[PDB]
Amino acid sequence: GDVEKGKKIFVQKCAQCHTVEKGGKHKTGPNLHGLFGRKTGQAPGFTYTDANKNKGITWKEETLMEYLENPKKYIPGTKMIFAGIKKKTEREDLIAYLKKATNE
Numbered sequence: 001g002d003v004e005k006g007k008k009i010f011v012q013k014c015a016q017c018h019t020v021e022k023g024g025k026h027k028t029g030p031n032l033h034g035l036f037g038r039k040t041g042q043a044p045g046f047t048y049t050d051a052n053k054n055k056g057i058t059w060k061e062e063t064l065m066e067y068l069e070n071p072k073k074y075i076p077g078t079k080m081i082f083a084g085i086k087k088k089t090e091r092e093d094l095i096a097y098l099k100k101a102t103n104e
């Protein structure tokens with residue numbers, strides 16, 4: 001995935017509700033730092049829905065791929081308001097960008 005394109009998608013579609021830096025603030029959504037290989041509902045300091053918490057999955061490329069295409073389908077009852085990125089290549093670019101950013 002194109003990490004630069006992925007960063008722009010993040011800035012346009014996710015930054016309104018999320019930070020990704022270590023020690024970044026919760027906004028509407030939880031800070032995403034350390035996302036990859038973490039279970040749902042794990043960011044310290046954030047009020048998650050039970051639906052998010054009870055999903056049981058680990059965030060990684062495959063589960064983010066499916067999640068971000070249609071969040072309400074993946075986690076019925078999630079309070080994340082987002083229709084989804086329907087284009088596979090835009091998801092791959094975004095996720096390639098998140099894999100770097102949330103890790104650093």
Ligand code: HEC
Pocket residue numbers: 010013014015016017018028029030035039040041042043047048049051052059068077078079080081082
């Ligand atoms: C506000 C209108 C948001 C937009 C736009 C985006 N996100 Fe979101 N995110 C938001 C909330 C309120 C929540 C918690 C939902 C709940 O049911 O508690 C989330 C959660 C996530 C998660 C789960 C994080 C976890 O620790 O389990 C992920 C992986 C995530 N969000 C990603 C994400 C991406 C990549 C976005 C842009 C495409 C995006 N969100 C937009 C709020 C909002």
